[PDB]
Structures are given as C-alpha cells and as structure tokens.
Design a protein around this ligand. Structure first.
Ligand code: ICS
Ligand code: CLF
Ligand code: CLF
Ligand SMILES: [Fe+3]
Ligand SMILES: [Fe+3]
Lengths: 476, 522, 522
C-alpha cells in the first residue's frame, strides 16, 4: 500500500542532510488516479541538485541531438569545441534514407573546432569561412543549421548577423540556434529553442506559395523521430487508412516537408513535450488542428486510428475499420504466443518525456503490470496525463538520483526495468533484466502493429534469458 | 505485415514491398530530392583528386574529427584511484555525454558527477555549485577522494577552483582533511589525453608538493608506472604481469581496470580497486617513474622531474618487439632485476609467429589513425612486420611528434610511401583512401562509415576496417584486448593476418570465377 | 603481362582478359564440358530436399568425412611426454601425412618416425624392421622413450608389437631398461581420438601395471589430469592456471604444450617439456584422476579404475559455465581446498559478458560439428547463451553419446529444434544447411567449402563459418586459442558475438539501400 512506499521514500531521503532532502521530497510521489493536477503532489521542471549524479542532458542535446539532427538534407554545425559533436555523433538511431556525405548528413559531425584563439578573439569570421567551406565541399546540402554549444553564448558571439549575411550572400537558408548547455535545466529547453528556430526560419518559406495541390486528407506527423523506424511503421499504418502524410519531421525529415507542413489538414503530434510549441503555433497562425496519438500497442493503436478517422468522412472511417480487421490476426497471434511467457511480470520505467507514459498500453497488452514510471525533463502536463493511465499505489519520481533509483529498485524488486544506457549495466549487475527504452536496445521498431511483434519478442528475450539465473556461484 | 514465427527487426522489415512503395511515395511526393544521377555525379566528384585538393584546403571546417575534449580524459584518470569520484565543475550535459561514451565503449557503469551550473552561475560564478555539490557528493556516495575537473563554461568564466575548494573546506561543507585535488581542463586546448595528463599532474601535486622534505629517492625500491590515457584493460594487466614476472616492485598509478571490469554477482560495486592514496603519497620515494605514453604526459614528466627529482627514462611506448625490449631492458637496469626465462620464451614465440605470418603480412598498405603514442607504436610494429603504413593520421598530434614519427619511418625502407598528417580528420582520410587506396584501415569505429563509402564506389575499391583503438562501439568486449608488450603484439599480429586471410577468402569465394584460389591451406 | 610495380599472384593474374580467352578456348575446344544450364539445374537439384533424401540413404559412400585415423591421435599423445619419440610401425606415407597435417595446423615442427615397412615386410613381418628402426632412432635422435603405434598395414597382418620389442631388447638393439611402450591403433576402428586413448592406456600400462604393490591412493596429495585429444594450447594453459590458482597439486599427464610452442631463438628443439616418466610411475599414488574428455577416454577409464583403483568422477568437459563450475567444485571436493575469489570474480566477468551479449546472441541458429566432447560442450554453452543448435553432427560419435546429447537438449527449451547426427559426413551437413538454413556454422576449415556452396545459391542463403575445432588450416595462430574454462567461454562468446555483428555490418553496408540500419553503436 501507500504506507510502505512513503516509508521507503523517507528512508531513501534520509541520506540528504538538510537541503537536498527538501528539494528531492517534492519530486517523489505516490500515484492517485483521482488527482487531476499533479502540482499538488509532485514538482518537476526544476534545477537539479549539484553532486547527485543526475541523468538529464543539456539544451544542446535537446536541440541538435533531438530536433535538428534527424533532418537529413540539412548540414548541422556544432559551433564550439570538438567534444559535443563527437559525443552526440550517430549515438541516436534517428533513421533516414539518403546517401551519407552527398545528400544526407545525419551521421556526420560538422564542427568549428574551437581553440584558444577562437575563444579569446571570437569565432564569427571562423563561422563565415565555415559556411563558405561547407557550401563548396557539400553542394547538395539544402540548408545549414548552427547549433551553439556553451562557449559561444558565454563569449558573446553574435551568430544571427553572420547567418543572415551568409543567407543573403549564397541564397541558402541558415538557421542559428542558441542552444547553449547552460540555458535551462534539461533537454526540454533545447526542444523549445529548436522549435522557435523552426518557427522563425523554416516554417514560413511558402506562406505566399500556392503551387502545392492539397487534398482533404492531409496530415503531418510531428515529433516522430524514426527511432529504429517507428515513424515508417506509423506512416504505413496511416497511409493504409487513406491519409496523405505530407510532412514527417524530424525523423526521416527533409526541409521541404517542414516547409509544406502549413498546408496539411491535421497535425498528429507523437511527442507532445518536444513539439507542442510548434503544434500550438500552427493552430494559432495557420488554423491547423492537432491531436496526440499513441501507436504503442494494439489497443492504443486501434484507439488512435479510430480517433484520427473520427474527423474525416465515412470513407476514411471504413478504411480504418478495414485496416483494423486486416491487422487484428497478427497482433492476436503475437499476444497468443507471448502473453503466457510474460503474464504477471512487473515493470518499472525511467526514460524521458513522452515514452514513459505511452509504453504503458502495450506493457499491459502483454499482461505485465507497471509499478513505477518517471521522467527527467517532463513538465506538469506530462504528469497530469500520466496520473490517469498509471495504476494506483505506484511510485513516481522526477530527476532521479542514481542512489535514489538504486535504493528504490532494491525495495520494489521488479522483474524488468526500462531506462537509458547510463543505468543499463548498473541494473544488469543486479540481476534485473533491463531494456534500453530509447535505443530499443539497438532493435526496433516498437510502434504500430509491426512494432508490437518486435516489442513482444524483445521483452521475452530479455525477461526469460538464462543468464539472469546464473549470477550466483553454486559454491557461494 | 509481421509473421509471428519469424519476426523481423528494422532490417530487413523495411525491405518489404509495401515499405519500399511507401518510402518511394514519400521521396517522390514531398521530399524534393535531387535526381539520382546528380547524386552519383557528386559522389564520384567527392572520390576524385580535385575534391581532395579542395578538402585539404580546409582552414575553418572540421568534419568527422578523431579526438575528444579534456574532461573525458580527466574522468578516465580519476576513475583509476581508490574510492575516487570524478567531479566535473560545469554543465551536466557534459557528464551525461562522458558517461554515455564510456558506457558504450566499456559496456560498464561509469560514475561521474556534476555541479549543474546554469545561466545564474554564468553571471555570479559557480561557488555555491562547488560547495553544495561537494557536500552532496560526499554525503550520498561516500568517496575517499573527489577529483575535480572543469567544463568549458567554467573555463570561459574563469572560476578559481583552488579558492572555491578552500572556501568550501573553511565554511564546513567538507572536512579539511578530505582529499579534493583539482585540475583545469579547457576543452579548447588539446584533447582528452591532455585532460588525463592535467588530472594526473593535479593529483600528484596535491598529494606530494607540500611533503617533499622527508622524501628520499629509491628508499622503497619500487618503480612508478604512469600508463596515461588507456582504454584496453589487457594493457594494464600485461604491464602488471610482466613487471611481476621480473620480480620488481612497482606502483602502477591511476589503475582503473577494477572499476572497469567489475564482476556481475547480483550487486553493484561503484568503487573497485584503484591506486591507493598511500601509494600516491609514497611515490616520490620510488626508484624512478616510467611513463608509458610520454607524448601526452608532458606536464606530468615536468612535475616528476622537477619535484620528485626522478630521472625519467626516454622510452617509447612498449609496443612491438624493439620497444618492448627497450622497456624491459631499462626496467632491468633501473631495478637491477634480470629478465627471466619466461619473458624470453614469450618474445621467441612472438618472433615465431612473425616468421609464420610474414609471407602474408609483407607489402600490405595500411591507413591508420588514433592517439599519438598508440599510432607511433602501431607504425613501428607495422614496420617490423614488413607492412607499409601509407596514411598516418593523428588529429591531436603536433609538429614534434610528426618529426619523431618521420624519423622512425626514415629508419626503415618500408616508410617510403608514408605521409604523416597532423591536425586532419576522417574526411581527409576518406579522400586519401579514395585517391591513394590502401589495403586496410586501422582505427576506431568511426572508420566504418569510410568503409561504406569505399564500397559505394565498388567492391574493388573497398578498404576494410580493422578495429584497434578507442572507441569501439559496434563490437563487443574488444576493450579486454591487449596492445602493449609481446602479448599485445601477438594479438595485433593475429588480428592483422586473420583480416588479410578473411579478405582473401571473401574475394575468392565466387564459383567458377575466382574459386581456383579458394585454398584450404593458407 | 606483369608490371614490376604491382606484381599479381594467381588471383587476380588469371582474371585478365588474355587468360580469360585462353581458358574459354580450352573449355570450348577440348573439355567437352557440360552446358552451363545443365550445371545450374544440377546444382539447384543438389540444394533441394529430394537430394537430401537421396543423400541420407547413403550406406557405402562417405563424402568429405570429419574424422581421421587412430595413429594420428597416437602421435599426438606420444608428443606429450618428455623426450618421447612417436614411432609408427608401418608405412612411411602415414607418418608423412600425419606430420603434414599437424604442421599445417600447429605451424610447428612435428617429430615422428616409422620403420618404413615395404612389400617384403608385409609378406614376412616387421620384426627386423622394428629392430633396425629402434636402434637407428635411439642412435640418431636420442630420445629417452619411444612410443610405438601401428598403421592399418601392420594391424591387418597381426604384427605382435610386444614380441617384436622384447626380441629387439633381447638381441641387443636397444637397452633392456629403455622404455618402449606400445599400443595397437587400427585405423579401421574408431578415429584419431580412439588412437589417443589407446596410446595413453599403453603408456600408463607400461609404467604402472607391474609396479602396483607399493602404491597407496592419495599418497602424494595430487590429482592426475588426462586432457585427451586437445589441439588448443590455451586449454592446457587454462587448466594448469586454474589448478594453480586453487593451490591444488596436479600432474597433467600428456602435456604437449612446450613441444608445440617452441620459441624462435636461433636453435631448433626436437623435445621440449612434456610429462616426465617420474610423474607417470607416481600416477597411481594420486588422490584421483580427472578425465577432461571422458567420451573418448573409455579404455583409459577402465584401466584407471581397475588397476589404479581411482574412483574417477563423472564430470563432463569443463566447457561453458555450468560444467566449469562442476569441474571446479569436484576438484575442490577431491583436494579439500576452497575455490579462491579470483575464480569467482572470473565467473562473474563471464556472466557479465553473457548479460551484455544476450540481446545479439538470443535466437541465433547454429550448425556445428567436431569431436564428441567438444561438440557436446559447444551445445551446452550455446544453450546457456540462449542460442538454438539446429544441426549437431559428430562423425565419430556413438549411440550413447547421442542419448547424452539428446538429454542435454531436452533439458533446455532452446533444444526443441535440435537434431543430432552420428556417422554423417559434411555432405550430409551441406544438404542440411541448404534445406534447413541456420544462421551460422561452427567447425573446422573443411566447412569453408560448404559456405562457398551456399554463396553459389544466393547471398541470402549464405551460411558463414566460424572456425572452432580441428583442423584449422586457412587461418594463422588460432591453435593459441582457449576453449576450456571461463577464459575459453569468454573467447567463444566474443567470437560468436563479433561474428554476428560482422555479418550484420556486411548486410547493412549498402548506401541508400540498407544503410539505415548501419548503426555505429551495437
Ligand atoms: S523527443 Fe525526447 S530521452 Fe520526446 S529528448 Fe529524448 S526520441 Fe526519450 S522519452 Mo532519448 S521526450 Fe523523444 C526522447 Fe522522449 S532522445 Fe528520445 S528516447 S519521445
Ligand atoms: S553542456 Fe551540452 S555537452 Fe556540455 S560543453 Fe555545453 S553544449 Fe556541450 Fe562540450 S567541448 Fe567538452 S562536452 Fe562540455 S567540456 Fe565543453
Ligand atoms: S602408406 Fe599411404 S597414407 Fe599410409 S595407410 Fe598406406 S596408402 Fe594410406 Fe591411411 S588410414 Fe591412416 S593414413 Fe595410414 S594408418 Fe592407414
Ligand atoms: Fe559489462
Ligand atoms: Fe610456429
């Protein structure tokens, strides 16, 4: 019940002497579905306590590594020292189709490679020569973005002027993003700045152009980052219904799709946290309605497909019914094969924003009860959405400390834990099966009916692996 | 459509006909893709010599670098001391990236904390971040030493780490006796190896500067070993094993092998092994200090010679035959202990393997890259094997190191077609292997993309990659390997000769076309 | 035509145009070669299941076997004793073939002699042949012992080794106290492992049968270890290392480590190391004898139990995790010494590696072959990894081994699709891998052709080979590897995971076609 959960929370917090305990008590809570506003029990979107080994990232990670990186035909310059591009290079599986180095540059690392002279005297002229060199060596690029790492915002470099001058000179769009790491407390502000850059530099280049033929079935997938091909599966599912997916970004995204987005009739937002800003802006300016959708699990997929078909004519509704009837036997077979091997298992998740609350439907579709979820950068609305779907008497955490996660797992003792790479081996050494909830553990997709089979197979292969039974030596 | 019996992951599920039709529609309808003939023309242009001339005229753009920033090496150095917590003064995204990098290489948990400095600390400094973070890190993780490195935010503002730590001790956030050494690791100067050097110098300074009055050189009959930035656990293990075989006392400083290879037995061990504080304090009493990678341990060498008054030997990295022989002979001269029969037998076995594989290793052309000391050791070993290193790339190398490597190449007739490039990146090496094709590349995982590019020009133009170096992300447990000493040379020789033979078998597998050379015995 | 700058060997010198025209003219003029379409349809027919049904009905024809004859194992056993000479009573062609086989595998000198019996010796016997041969061998090569095996020629004619040796001693050709053990090794019975067993039983009989009056079990506080037919020096190394870490006194009978691993230091050594005769005469005094490969050490077990009176434990081969644990626990029980923390930590490291690699290892299908004990150990280790053995082939297996492996498969859930074949050759395995395609194959170099076969059907039907076993001819220095113990399990795990990842990288190297799954991090 709640008494033991609160006792465990207090016991874990006892380590923090005076102030860290007060800060961390606010981010730990116990679920209650009757609560609408999560601000009464949990507090998020706050600065992290120093020296606690947080798992959050920076604004540069949320801008370059999340929103702008997946755009294939654009060249993204990590303005600053070599480190951040190096570490952010190809470490995220935002899949795409293109020839790398010619018309695709997702896995490439472009940087200004700041030195001491650049720090002391600035790097605006270096950025100008950067842009000319990029244009001469990569002529098929369709635009350049300039993601600012820490030193650039610190030394007061003004890259908007050089970006505008170069855009005028070479007649190519150049998007300056001030995504310095010190800004904000996590990757969420990186999403906000990247969204503002898209709004102010890309979204309105065809506001006076009407050469695009439009159909009443025009939709745009917003916030689908094609992590292992989730966007492709969702897109095939939506096109089997008869809807034209005109735009798809950032995952497998081109600048042309972003430019054509204002012409669609609906905005299907997958990740609310990372693109709600542009969703509301497109509702306000162009009058395009948007909805949240969930393709993670057959039940949630069916519900989302029916909801999307609700606001089109009868043809679209009947095509949605036909798609559901077509894909029903496949996920029924997946459930039949994999439910007996997973019924009753307990899961705890700590991933990020949208995913920790959206995986719940397919986790339950296989019969596995979820007893704890948490975020690192989500806002209060994310928790408000989480309360309804999450079950009662479950532990919720924000900005988890590695110590906190360690001693929470040592008490709850679940059968499976889904988190990032920085906890994979920590939890592996404890005998608890682990799944990389972002990397999908170098597998996927997990979205759509096709992704449900892979998700079930991966859950089975990790949860019932023999290696988890051999951690204790027979003589010990 | 997914069949329940044979579930397909992304490959080759996206090879299905419906998916191809959907991607084709997406590309043709709204992507505004350039025509494919233009793509082919631009690719062929990028593989040309004129593109190489344009690429080598780069002065402001770096594409696909082969180096990292200082705090990563500082964290790796700090991980090598007992119950030590790496503490980065600056942003938290840096620590997230360092942890991700080291997890993806070692497949292990890596412990590092940050003080989480924000925009406020950019106007008023990071003093309170230091105090609160040091207190919290001491409270919840209970280390015996907190080793403080910096992030570029902290270097641009100009935070005084010494004053910050001293004030934190004075107020009462940490006990005055608690070891908190520090080092300045600017990311715009040098690379991760420089960060390792700075961290080691800082730790040595903190533990030895104000206690040199009672120190006598050689009073404890031990040899200090400083390994530098090392990501192969086999290297630490082999150094310890060969120094124990000779029966010489050693004190390996900054040994992280235990925390990087913790056993999985149902519990998480955040700390394991490492160099003790007593060892670090007793270091000035040793006979001498030997640096395995002197080309990025310059400031450590300066501090050891100036303060500890140790006549540091001029030794190259113990890679290959000759340099391992020089290392062993110098250790024998310093300690007075003769080289035993086991080491001689192991050297003879390496020579035997060389005699066995020389007919396959001769004349092979290699493009290799990595860290300065590792690259120079590999070049030396390749010269001993009769191979021809053609493209030697070191992004973080300097003019003096290039001159040393050129002198090494001049000593052998196999360095005639060798050019050493410093300050270049993997795009330069892509151009070099397209224009001056080698037989193989030797480098980290980032080279795999280059291989793909070569395969796009044609099978005959492909340059296979051999994964030796840091980081290796697409293979498992290669970090347990060895590169130093006779054992490391044996492993490198086996890797090289097996790569050559596997490539030869691949090229001659076609039936009735190239199968006449598909020999059972090679 | 050859260019002195770039000289071409057979590949690709026979790919130039003029050679192609010459070959085409010869083919079209003088071979009367079958039309190509006939060849393609015959190959396709060979890949079908009707051809599989015809193939598995074979009763008299053996195509590409997977075994050798007894005297090869006899020579290998004789090479494991100090200054011992493998003498083979029979024809010289047999010794030439044995020497060439072991030279190609180990890449080391292999010393073996024969009496070179001719037709007149066939008609009249080999008594004078063995007298002269023993005298010449002792005079020229100066061994301390001569271990005599037989060829099929001598086994058919009923050559009495005992009488011949006793007559040679009586007539003065060799000293009476010179040890000349013998074993009958008929090549038409069993295989090479049977010859190893017979040779070891003969040596043990010669040294212990007549001197068991003053022998007390457990007098010298040691455990005898009988390795059997082993072709990985790392296996002997790991067994000795693990026994020494436990502090257990042991006597590794038939230790061929040194004679197959001599250094290249300027001199040639015919003999090196080896089990000493004093160790053999003191063998009955040991606590107990442990057989590492019990499935071919049957006669040795009978002799040890019936004469030495040692209650030999029922242990499988110490391969994989569980069987290594059982071996260590049994050795601890016999010797009374606890398992040290080093081996517990090594087991933890192995379990950590399995935990890291389970994602890429789960569900993969393997077709493997080799010796009985080694094959069953691979089956067990693969089952522990979650892998699925589908085709298990042992040409030199029997019904009892089939039952044991069937029980092992039935214990695990990863053996529901596993079939075990005994008495089948590699042509049967070719049919199986064509009709029920596994992900990979695990065997010796002879499997490479099978891989070639699969590649001729298509890139999607190719079955890559992983080289574990005996003999390995087309790769260098793989006999250095380890398969036994935790170190062997780590090596096998690394090889399998990296093979899977390399295959995936090859499948995803197509630009714009399959490079979406060409991930840097795996
Ligand atoms: S963008 Fe966000 S951490 Fe919404 S920064 Fe992060 S590809 Fe996570 S839970 Mo990595 S808010 Fe996407 C995410 Fe979720 S990189 Fe991916 S998995 S749905
Ligand atoms: S919070 Fe984020 S990742 Fe950190 S620096 Fe800032 S944008 Fe970048 Fe960069 S080079 Fe290295 S990793 Fe830093 S110390 Fe600077
Ligand atoms: S001299 Fe020549 S190679 Fe020798 S047997 Fe005679 S034909 Fe043959 Fe054959 S199976 Fe083995 S290798 Fe012999 S013992 Fe018989
Ligand atoms: Fe690990
Ligand atoms: Fe050899």
């Amino acid at each position: 019940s709640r008494e033991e959960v609160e006792s465990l929370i207090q016991e874990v917090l006892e380590v923090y002497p005076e102030k860290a305990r007060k800060d961390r008590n606010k981010h730990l809570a116990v679920n209650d579905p009757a609560v609408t506003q999560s601000k009464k029990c949990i507090i998020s979107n706050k600065k992290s306590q120093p020296g606690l080994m947080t798992i959050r990232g920076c604004a540069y990670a949320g801008s370059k590594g999340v929103v702008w990186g997946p755009i294939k035909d654009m060249i993204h310059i990590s303005h600053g020292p070599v480190g951040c591009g190096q570490y952010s290079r190809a470490g995220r599986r935002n899949y795409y189709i293109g020839t790398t180095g010619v018309n695709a540059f997702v896995t490439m690392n472009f940087t200004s490679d700041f030195q001491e002279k650049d720090i002391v005297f600035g790097g605006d002229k270096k950025l100008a020569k950067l842009i000319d060199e990029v244009e001469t060596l990569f002529p098929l690029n369709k635009g350049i973005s300039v993601q600012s790492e820490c030193p650039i915002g610190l030394i007061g470099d003004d890259i908007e002027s050089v970006s505008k001058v170069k855009g005028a000179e070479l007649s190519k769009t150049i998007v300056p993003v001030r995504c310095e790491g010190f800004r904000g407390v996590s990757q969420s502000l990186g999403h906000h700045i990247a969204n503002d850059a898209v709004r102010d530099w890309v979204l309105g280049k065809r506001d006076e152009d009407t050469t695009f033929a439009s159909t009443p079935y025009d939709v745009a997938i917003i916030g689908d980052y094609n992590i292992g091909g989730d966007a492709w599966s969702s897109r095939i599912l939506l096109e089997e219904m008869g809807l034209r997916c005109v735009a798809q970004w950032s995952g497998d995204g081109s600048i042309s799709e972003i430019e054509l987005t204002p012409k669609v009739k609906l905005n299907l937002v997958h990740c609310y946290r990372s693109m709600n800003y542009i969703s509301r802006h497109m509702e306000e300016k162009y009058g395009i309605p948007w909805m949240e959708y969930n393709f993670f699990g057959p039940t949630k997929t069916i519900e989302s497909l029916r909801a999307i078909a609700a606001k089109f004519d009868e043809s679209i509704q009947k095509k949605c019914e036909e798609v559901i009837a077509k894909y029903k036997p496949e996920w029924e077979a997946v459930v039949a094969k994999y439910r007996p091997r997973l019924e009753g298992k307990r899961v705890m998740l700590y991933i990020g924003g949208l995913r920790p609350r959206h995986v719940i439907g397919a986790y339950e579709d296989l019969g596995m009860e979820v007893v704890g979820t948490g975020y690192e950068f989500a806002h209060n609305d994310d928790y408000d959405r989480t309360m309804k779907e999450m079950g009662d008497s479950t532990l919720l955490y924000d900005d988890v400390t590695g110590y906190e996660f360690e001693e929470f797992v040592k008490r709850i003792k679940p059968d499976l834990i889904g988190s990032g790479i920085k906890e994979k081996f920590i939890f592996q050494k404890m005998g608890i099966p682990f799944r990389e909830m972002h990397s999908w553990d170098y597998s996927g997709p997990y979205h759509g009916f096709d992704g449900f089979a892979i998700f079930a197979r991966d859950m089975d292969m990790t949860l019932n692996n023999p290696c988890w039974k051999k951690l204790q030596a027979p003589w010990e | 459509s997914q069949q329940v019996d044979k579930i397909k992951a992304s490959y080759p599920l996206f090879l299905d006909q419906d998916y191809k039709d959907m991607l084709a529609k997406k590309r043709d309808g709204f992507e505004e893709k350039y025509p494919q003939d233009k793509i082919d023309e631009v690719f062929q242009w990028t593989t040309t010599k004129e593109y190489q001339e344009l690429n080598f005229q780069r002065e402001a753009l770096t594409v696909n670098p082969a180096k990292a920033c200082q705090p990563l090496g500082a964290v790796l150095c700090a991980l090598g001391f007992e119950k030590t917590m790496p503490y980065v003064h600056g942003s938290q995204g840096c620590v997230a990236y360092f942890r991700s990098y080291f997890n993806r290489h070692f497949r292990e948990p890596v412990s590092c904390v940050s003080d989480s400095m924000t925009e406020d600390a950019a106007v008023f400094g990071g003093q309170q971040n230091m105090k609160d973070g040091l207190q919290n890190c001491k409270a919840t993780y209970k280390p015996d030493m907190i080793a403080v490195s910096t992030t570029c935010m902290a270097e641009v503002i100009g935070d005084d780490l010494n004053a910050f730590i001293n004030n934190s001790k004075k107020e009462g956030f940490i006990p005055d006796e608690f070891p908190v050494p520090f080092a300045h690791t600017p990311s715009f100067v040098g690379s991760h190896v420089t960060g390792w050097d700075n961290m080691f110098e800082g730790i040595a300074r903190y533990f030895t500067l104000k206690s040199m009055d009672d120190k006598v050189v050689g009073s404890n009959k031990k040899i200090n070993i400083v390994p530098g930035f090392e990501t192969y656990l086999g290297n630490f293990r082999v150094i310890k094993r060969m120094l124990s075989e000779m029966g010489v006392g050693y004190s390996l400083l900054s040994d992280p092998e235990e925390v990087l290879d913790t056993p999985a037995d149902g519990q998480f061990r955040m700390y394991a092994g490492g160099t003790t504080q007593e060892e670090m304090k007793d270091a000035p009493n040793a006979l001498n200090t030997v640096l395995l990678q002197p080309w990025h341990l310059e400031k450590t060498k300066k501090f050891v010679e100036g303060t500890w008054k140790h006549e540091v030997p001029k030794l190259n990295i113990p890679m290959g035959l000759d340099w391992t022989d020089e290392f062993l002979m110098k250790v024998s001269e310093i300690s007075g202990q003769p080289i035993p029969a086991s080491l001689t037998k192991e050297r003879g076995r390496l020579v035997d393997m060389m005699t066995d594989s020389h007919t396959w290793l001769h004349g092979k052309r290699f493009a290799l890259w990595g860290d300065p000391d590792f690259v120079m050791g590999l070049v030396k070993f390749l010269l001993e094997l009769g191979c021809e290193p053609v493209h030697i790339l070191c992004h973080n190398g300097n003019k003096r190191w290039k001159k040393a490597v050129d002198a090494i190449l001049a000593a052998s007739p196999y360095g005639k077609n060798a050019t050493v490039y410093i300050g270049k990146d993997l795009w330069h090496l892509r151009s070099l292997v397209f224009t001056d094709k080698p037989d193989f590349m030797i480098g980290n995982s980032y080279g795999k993309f280059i291989q793909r590019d070569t395969l796009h020009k044609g099978k005959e133009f492909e340059v296979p990659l051999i994964r030796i170096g840091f980081p290796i992300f697409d293979r498992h447990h290669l970090h347990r390997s060895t590169t130093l000493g006779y054992e490391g040379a044996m492993q490198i020789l086996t890797t090289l000769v097996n790569s050559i033979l596997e490539r030869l078998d691949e090229e001659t597998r076609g039936m009735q076309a190239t199968d006449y050379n598909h020999d059972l015995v090679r």
